[PDB]
Amino acid sequence: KNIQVVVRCRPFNAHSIVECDPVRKEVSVKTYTFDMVFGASTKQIDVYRSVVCPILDEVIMGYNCTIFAYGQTGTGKTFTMEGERSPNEEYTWEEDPLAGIIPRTLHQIFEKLTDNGTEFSVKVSLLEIYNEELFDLLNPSSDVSERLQMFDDPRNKRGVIIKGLEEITVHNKDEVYQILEKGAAKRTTAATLMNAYSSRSHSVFSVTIHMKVKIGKLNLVDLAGSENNQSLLTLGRVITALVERTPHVPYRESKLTRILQDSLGGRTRTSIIATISPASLNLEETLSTLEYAHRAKNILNK
Amino acid sequence: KNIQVVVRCRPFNLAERKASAHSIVECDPVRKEVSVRTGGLADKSSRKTYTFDMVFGASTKQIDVYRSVVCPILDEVIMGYNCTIFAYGQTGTGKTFTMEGERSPNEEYTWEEDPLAGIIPRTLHQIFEKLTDNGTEFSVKVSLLEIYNEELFDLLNPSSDVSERLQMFDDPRNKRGVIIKGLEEITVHNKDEVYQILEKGAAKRTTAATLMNAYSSRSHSVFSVTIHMKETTIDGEELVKIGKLNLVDLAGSENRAREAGNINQSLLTLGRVITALVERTPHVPYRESKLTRILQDSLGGRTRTSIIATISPASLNLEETLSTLEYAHRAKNILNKPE
Amino acid sequence: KNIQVVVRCRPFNLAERKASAHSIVECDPVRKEVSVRTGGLADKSSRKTYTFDMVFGASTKQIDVYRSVVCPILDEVIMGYNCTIFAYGQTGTGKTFTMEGERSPNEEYTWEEDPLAGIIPRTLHQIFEKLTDNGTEFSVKVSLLEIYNEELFDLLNPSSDVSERLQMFDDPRNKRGVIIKGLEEITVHNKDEVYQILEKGAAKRTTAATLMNAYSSRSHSVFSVTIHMKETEELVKIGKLNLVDLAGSENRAREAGNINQSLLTLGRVITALVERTPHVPYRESKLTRILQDSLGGRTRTSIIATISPASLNLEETLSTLEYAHRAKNILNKP
Ligand SMILES: Cc1ccc(C(=O)N(CCCN)[C@@H](c2nc3cc(Cl)ccc3c(=O)n2Cc2ccccc2)C(C)C)cc1
Ligand SMILES: Cc1ccc(C(=O)N(CCCN)[C@@H](c2nc3cc(Cl)ccc3c(=O)n2Cc2ccccc2)C(C)C)cc1
Ligand SMILES: Cc1ccc(C(=O)N(CCCN)[C@@H](c2nc3cc(Cl)ccc3c(=O)n2Cc2ccccc2)C(C)C)cc1
Ligand SMILES: Nc1ncnc2c1ncn2[C@@H]1O[C@H](COP(=O)(O)OP(=O)(O)O)[C@@H](O)[C@H]1O
Ligand SMILES: Nc1ncnc2c1ncn2[C@@H]1O[C@H](COP(=O)(O)OP(=O)(O)O)[C@@H](O)[C@H]1O
Ligand SMILES: Nc1ncnc2c1ncn2[C@@H]1O[C@H](COP(=O)(O)OP(=O)(O)O)[C@@H](O)[C@H]1O
Ligand SMILES: [Cl-]
Ligand SMILES: [Cl-]
Ligand SMILES: [Mg+2]
């Protein structure tokens, strides 16, 4: 109920081995049923208003939520969470139809919170988990190799502290672009230095809201490629345990699930977007991802 | 009070006639009520009643709509305010007839005199007449923007391609305002020039319709007149004023289905904005749709806003008709008075 | 340098013979040099000489300015780059003649074929002939902006009052672009629509001169052509060309102080671009903010400095050349 699992299939770029029916909420390659399904034609704005938008209402209530993008490389994970700029500087990013979830989300927050007329405060942070180590993508001064320290939080027994993690204040929607642009530059230095790692790292973006005093928080997680590990294995199980309420959820077995435990249980909503390729050679992988999403929340066909 | 919600019922069409539909809708102008028979061909007893600021039954004349709804607003606009009038409701119920109106067949009338002329031509004629009459020094600009499938188009630019999309930006001076880059505001010097500007706009609109799927029922249309006035009196006050009036013909309320889905969203947003402004709620979600964002500077601030909600009499429309009246009633909730 | 500076001296005309004047200016096209007799019998031997990228003397035809200046630039625009060509100099030294040109007496020719046409008409014709020949799909927009007393006006809007001022803003989509709220950009589908559009603009320019005194000598004129070109992977390339007829270089005295300001900072900006200074003061005038899109980048920029040969004009003439040399400093040959 509070954990939605949706699939989105991307456009190619001819042999189509998949198929998706939105009304019957089914993906056929072999057939699975989900909370929602998006076919190749599907558009960034659609994904946003169906999956993300309801979750952000909750976040604005003072809840803490998380949205994952899961899948292999080439399926639209970075496309879905981040997006691209349309050609010829035709659009502002707030209007760009090719803008992914993170931009739409930050735009939406300033739209909704400005409409409300109340004093509010916005904060973002972005961290990468690579080989069970945590790195801060928004700290301007730190070298790209500095690991962060995290430990359990004496005040919060759902929580941890990530020590020194930069929380950047976004004063207005405009400033958001500079912030994440530097982050992208840093992250491009980290990938060069360490083992061509963009497919191997987990991105945790976090926006936190202070409404003057209720606090919402949303974490937008772009996981490392699901093709073949541990952080992926552990999350399935944390998800499995949260679906059925089998006690002692194994949060402690990965950095990801420890960092997230606070949101992953509490009064919350959690979604994961499983991304798949239509193309011929991806087939083993598509099946893993649907199986994985199937394992996550098990929904029998109709 | 500055927000008025009214309903206008049209007569039957041929289709409802040939189709043996029966009238389910009753209008009582004096009590400002609309009743609908909700019980189909089985029950004649079931009725739902709504009350609004005014109700125009099927015999209502264009001029009647103009005098009650528009003139009080036009007075305000000439005084230097910025106001808005919407036509809301199901495709084929009269939004265009109301806003634009129609030529009387067999020639006869000038458009200035034609009893079938709607709000837009009557409004423009009166602007020129009223200001020419008090000796105001003034100028008039008109623009027409279509919001279609999430995109912006300009119908009064005669040179540009119907496929040309326009971009929206914040207005740096004003948090309530936007700028639509390249939207033409055409200066019209008299009532003839506005006839020819709109005659061309209609042709360009037909062209666009032919090009794009379900075009009139799927677009919002924003017609805007801006008036710059300077009133000068020897040995007296010199007043400068800027009036603005938006006449908005909304997309069909009946409801790709993502296209039909997205229309439905901006409609609900508009509804929420109106509800909030009647209620004086602090959260007015202006920024949740293009339409409401574009109209925010009119709707915010000191104005008059009216909605004309149009419906069919026919039984074959029951669901849509009820949905429309629920929408109107949700925008401004007036309590039924005892019978 | 993709900044080309050239100089054009027009012929000694009737009135200057009626003024019984003396031609003081000499152009070496081959040496690319201009020299002026500076002394008026004070020496009368005395000479100033300047070197440039090209120099066009009194006998230069319109087609020669087009070939050497405009063509290379057009080519770059059609590749998708923004460029700017300026005419700079004293009033009645030939800027309008150069940018616009004149109709041939008679009815001898059509403007398309008229040997007296200036840069603007030759440029539009060529854009239409070239992209049509190219066979791919394209569209052409034009706008004409006047900057008079640091206010913006739209000369191509038929309907609007010649006194309506426009407001400008940064374009949030890019660093160098601006938005001039309400500036019309008229789509032109063929060469014939161009003539109509510019003729209406001429009247509106004429009626606006009748109002605000000075004008064409006191205002900057910015003419922009924007071309959208479709390719195939399917792509749009976008070129833009600005043709800028600057306010007179000579110099109420208030606008005069200010015209000089922009012209001055325009100079500052050009120098900054030729010899690279870290911060180019684009923002220090309306004109340079507006031209910023076409100055930064891979761009061919060109300035055509116009001058009179006559003695009556010495002072102005030397400033102009000095202005041009200051903007890009080259060195004399043997
Ligand atoms: C509309 C749009 C979409 C994407 C971009 C873009 O390519 N990037 C760079 C990386 C995208 N793969 C933007 C971007 N960068 C990110 C960097 C990191 Cl480390 C994490 C997330 C993002 C991200 O979401 N974006 C997209 C974006 C665009 C505008 C505003 C916020 C976010 C930045 C120029 C701001 C630009 C404009
Ligand atoms: C008395 C009368 C009423 C309607 C018309 C009419 O049919 N049209 C075309 C649209 C029909 N739906 C007129 C008209 N066209 C418009 C085009 C656009 Cl894009 C937007 C609004 C209008 C519009 O309001 N009208 C009505 C009108 C009539 C006379 C003067 C001004 C406007 C034009 C001939 C001027 C003609 C005369
Ligand atoms: C071959 C030719 C050259 C000049 C003209 C001419 O005199 N004008 C008027 C302005 C003269 N200074 C033409 C013209 N007008 C302009 C008006 C403005 Cl506001 C800005 C530029 C021009 C301009 O460049 N021209 C020349 C021209 C001629 C034909 C086609 C395009 C441009 C118009 C009849 C089209 C006519 C024919
Ligand atoms: N829904 C979609 N619509 C259009 N293109 C898509 C979609 N999903 C993915 N793509 C394409 O995927 C490419 C980017 O792949 P990306 O998502 O960056 O890989 P990864 O998930 O490994 O980071 C882009 O060329 C983009 O066009
Ligand atoms: N109140 C009315 N009186 C007479 N004719 C009307 C009335 N309302 C609508 N019509 C006619 O009914 C048809 C549909 O109305 P129209 O306003 O054009 O549709 P829409 O609501 O889709 O814009 C048109 O022929 C119009 O002329
Ligand atoms: N290169 C030239 N060849 C022939 N005539 C010229 C030349 N340059 C200028 N003229 C003449 O000088 C006159 C006045 O200068 P003009 O062209 O109006 O420039 P400005 O706008 O600076 O006055 C024009 O009518 C034109 O005939
Ligand atoms: Cl604009
Ligand atoms: Cl030709
Ligand atoms: Mg309509």
UniProtKB/Swiss-Prot annotation, chain A:
GO cellular component: ciliary basal body; cytosol; intracellular membrane-bounded organelle; kinesin complex; membrane; microtubule; mitotic spindle; nucleus
Protein name as annotated: Kinesin-like protein KIF11
Binding site for ATP: G71, Q72, T73, G74, T75, G76, K77, T78
GO molecular function: ATP binding; microtubule binding; microtubule motor activity; plus-end-directed microtubule motor activity; protein kinase binding
Domain Kinesin motor, first and last residues per copy: 2-299
Keyword Cell division tagged: yes
GO BP terms in the entry: cell division; microtubule-based movement; mitotic cell cycle; mitotic centrosome separation; mitotic spindle assembly; mitotic spindle organization; regulation of mitotic centrosome separation; spindle elongation
Free-text description of this protein's post-translational modifications in UniProt: A subset of this protein primarily localized at the spindle pole is phosphorylated by NEK6 during mitosis; phosphorylation is required for mitotic function.
Location(s) in or outside the cell: Cytoplasm; Cytoplasm, Cytoskeleton, Spindle pole
Main location: cytoplasm
Keywords on record: Acetylation, ATP-binding, Cell cycle, Cell division, Coiled coil, Cytoplasm, Cytoskeleton, Disease variant, Isopeptide bond, Microtubule, Mitosis, Motor protein, Nucleotide-binding, Phosphoprotein, Ubl conjugation
Keyword Phosphoprotein: yes
Function text: Motor protein required for establishing a bipolar spindle and thus contributing to chromosome congression during mitosis. Required in non-mitotic cells for transport of secretory proteins from the Golgi complex to the cell surface.
UniProt family annotation: Belongs to the TRAFAC class myosin-kinesin ATPase superfamily. Kinesin family. BimC subfamily.
Encoding gene per record: KIF11
Disease / disorder: Microcephaly with or without chorioretinopathy, lymphedema, or impaired intellectual development: An autosomal dominant disorder that involves an overlapping but variable spectrum of central nervous system and ocular developmental anomalies. Microcephaly ranges from mild to severe and is often associated with mild to moderate developmental delay and a characteristic facial phenotype with upslanting palpebral fissures, broad nose with rounded tip, long philtrum with thin upper lip, prominent chin, and prominent ears.
Subunit and partners: Interacts with the thyroid hormone receptor in the presence of thyroid hormone. Component of a large chromatin remodeling complex, at least composed of MYSM1, PCAF, RBM10 and KIF11/TRIP5. Interacts (via C-terminus) with the kinase NEK6 in both interphase and mitosis. Interacts with RARRES1 and AGBL2. Interacts with TPX2.
Residues the record lists as N6-acetyllysine modifications: K112
Shown residues in whole-protein numbering: 17 to 362 of 1056
Swiss-Prot record, chain C:
Domain Kinesin motor per the UniProt entry, residue ranges: 2-330
Highest taxon of the lineage: Eukaryota
Intracellular or extracellular location(s): Cytoplasm; Cytoplasm, Cytoskeleton, Spindle pole
Binding, ATP: G89, Q90, T91, G92, T93, G94, K95, T96
Post-translational changes noted in the entry: A subset of this protein primarily localized at the spindle pole is phosphorylated by NEK6 during mitosis; phosphorylation is required for mitotic function.
Location of N6-acetyllysine modifications: K130
Disorder association: Microcephaly with or without chorioretinopathy, lymphedema, or impaired intellectual development: An autosomal dominant disorder that involves an overlapping but variable spectrum of central nervous system and ocular developmental anomalies. Microcephaly ranges from mild to severe and is often associated with mild to moderate developmental delay and a characteristic facial phenotype with upslanting palpebral fissures, broad nose with rounded tip, long philtrum with thin upper lip, prominent chin, and prominent ears.
Oligomer and partners: Interacts with the thyroid hormone receptor in the presence of thyroid hormone. Component of a large chromatin remodeling complex, at least composed of MYSM1, PCAF, RBM10 and KIF11/TRIP5. Interacts (via C-terminus) with the kinase NEK6 in both interphase and mitosis. Interacts with RARRES1 and AGBL2. Interacts with TPX2.
Family per record: Belongs to the TRAFAC class myosin-kinesin ATPase superfamily. Kinesin family. BimC subfamily.
Biological role stated in the UniProt entry: Motor protein required for establishing a bipolar spindle and thus contributing to chromosome congression during mitosis. Required in non-mitotic cells for transport of secretory proteins from the Golgi complex to the cell surface.
Entry protein name: Kinesin-like protein KIF11
Species whose genome carries this gene: Homo sapiens
Organism lineage: Eukaryota, Metazoa, Chordata, Craniata, Vertebrata
Protein's gene: KIF11
Covered residues, full protein: 17 to 363 of 1056
